[PDB]
Input
Amino acid sequence: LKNSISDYTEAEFVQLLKEIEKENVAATDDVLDVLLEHFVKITEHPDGTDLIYYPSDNRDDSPEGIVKEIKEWRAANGKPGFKQ
Amino acid sequence: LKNSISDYTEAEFVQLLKEIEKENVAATDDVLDVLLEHFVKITEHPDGTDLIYYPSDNRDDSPEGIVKEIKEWRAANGKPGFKQ
Amino acid sequence: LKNSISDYTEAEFVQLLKEIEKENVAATDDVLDVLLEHFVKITEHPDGTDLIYYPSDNRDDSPEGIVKEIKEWRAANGKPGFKQ
Amino acid sequence: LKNSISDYTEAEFVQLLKEIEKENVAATDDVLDVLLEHFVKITEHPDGTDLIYYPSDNRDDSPEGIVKEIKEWRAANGKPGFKQ
Amino acid sequence: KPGKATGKGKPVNNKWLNNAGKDLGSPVPDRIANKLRDKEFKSFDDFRKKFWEEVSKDPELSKQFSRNNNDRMKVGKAPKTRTQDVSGKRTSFELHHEKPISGGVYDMDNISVVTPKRHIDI
Amino acid sequence: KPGKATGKGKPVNNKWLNNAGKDLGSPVPDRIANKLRDKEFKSFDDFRKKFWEEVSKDPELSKQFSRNNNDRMKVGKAPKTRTQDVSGKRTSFELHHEKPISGGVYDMDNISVVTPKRHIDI
Amino acid sequence: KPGKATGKGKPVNNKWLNNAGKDLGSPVPDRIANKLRDKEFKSFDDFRKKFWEEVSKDPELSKQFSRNNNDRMKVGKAPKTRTQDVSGKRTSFELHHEKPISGGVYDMDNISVVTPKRHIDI
Amino acid sequence: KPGKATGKGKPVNNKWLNNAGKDLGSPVPDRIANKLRDKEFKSFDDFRKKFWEEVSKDPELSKQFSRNNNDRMKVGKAPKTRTQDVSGKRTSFELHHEKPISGGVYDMDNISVVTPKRHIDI
Ligand SMILES: [Zn+2]
Ligand SMILES: [Zn+2]
Ligand SMILES: [Zn+2]
Ligand SMILES: [Zn+2]
Output
């Protein structure tokens, strides 16, 4: 769990999303909610978890779609992107 | 890793599928391939991993769709289903 | 994560302890601390996490030692033990 | 799973060992055995898994002890060590 | 305590939970009631779990949720609400009883789905 | 050893890998070549990883694969082939050089995608 | 098939498995037999699991194994053998019946612990 | 901001942190200072991480901690304190500067280890 989007390559952020998907189906949300808090903190997107649970119909509801939307928003707001 | 489809509730099989999804994006397939061998062995479906990587266009490409197809096939062939 | 010591076989509680050991060496304590809160809640031992990080010199500092101390304390206080 | 000891910092190798410890207590050895094969391959120690299951009485039976023995052996044989 | 589910619920559109943060929230879908009716549950929690799992199996309702929320319901957990409808640690849809113990615990006609924000106001 | 990618590849339909188990297999998509051309790679393995990641970013190609295979490519791994096209431990599409070292290691026009079964026959 | 454990086993030193790769291997510890005697098991596998768990609980025997092997036995799995005693995929101590079905499946006096290498020779 | 570690610390007994919840807490071990002296760190956090890792490598100090706490320090994290010395979310030993910015950020002689409870009182 890095404390900055700049520390994540696109592939590593996808791994983070699949870890969240695994906790989604776990018995409880104890672990899930901690991963989501981290996701919201580093992404800095105003809609937070909506990127995961309420994806825009204008893009794919997939780990790849989530990364693309984050990339576009952070770029449009002059924020550092994923680690190249 | 139970050694029988009858030991898995539908929810638990979904957890197995999300574990496979996590290994899908891991650096290597070392762990993934072991989980897939197990998946093929307990499911007993002739198409094996195709249920995961080559889903029929007549059903959803999701953990839920995979479980439904397995349920329908095992029932149609007189094989025990998921643990109720 | 069951919400009762009675739902755990001794082997399953050991798995819980090894999961905690894995998070112990993770980059941060975000996940670790949630597992520890759960551990303290179900065990009901007044010393809480001390059973893990400050084991009595009168027993083994191992997953097996932790389970034995918990078993002895819960039995001595008339509380339900591990699932047989 | 890196394919070289030089890609692992001492802390990261410890994480690898705790992952092995977790699989040690899993229901089966399917995953465990793959992690062990990887461990044996990158370490290149002739005794392989003995470093984990049959530690010398001249050092600690702990993740830290395992790393130290590997460091000493690879250094004594002119092999590259952990990533600094 | 245990009991059996009763009730008929109500027909819903393709925007079932759109009004979960208003008034008494969204009702129990009649197709869902048909699957849960006359079934015994050890507790309301057991009911809540079976409820969401049933929602994940109804094609008309599952299509109204994202892939991540569908996975949540498939294992018996309530779907996450929108960020704007959360309140503290409560971040998922909750079931609310119209007529409290003062009852009908398993009365699907006395049960509805509401957001955390709205539930607190109630 | 390192080098730079060169070549133009070829235009492909919505069934790109349908003929990966026949003849020399499927060619490098021209849109993919455009993204990899003139880029340096430390090894062919590095090329292979970047190749698949590029495929996952091309909407016209990603739609030809399932969600699980798209995730594989997104991290640089080759997609899994159909069960019928596997051979032992080799269960994913492989890159084959038409003209071996006897060369063009990064020559996208001398590279193609083939299934394990077909690769062994070659 | 199911059955009940019988037998007395034999007293062992602080090097119980030192001779597991010779002759018929190491015998069932008498202290272990005392804990398993007269107990019913659904299969030999069930017996094998309970066997190792009992070994992990005996202070005199657990001290003869490393921390990693103790964790294995604690969950019913056989301890790993030394690298020199393995044979292919068989890397853990195995239970061998002296008198086969030609019997005594749960007869602890007809059961012993042997290494893969030695078991194959037998 | 970055800087270099300086100082000599102090000799400690086999109960180094026994007084971490009193006065200014426990001092930086002189053997630890010898390993960190003259080394550059990007931040105090970087120092804190290297500090604990060094403690895990000192046989005289590591033996004063349990196996779980040793693993924590091995990766740069502070050991967990006793339940009685925690305070809210702060459950691990903290480093305290005697003379604040009003300084010596990397001055090991101006740094000590204290428990959450005691740190708050300070
Ligand atoms: Zn209510
Ligand atoms: Zn070739
Ligand atoms: Zn035999
Ligand atoms: Zn301070």
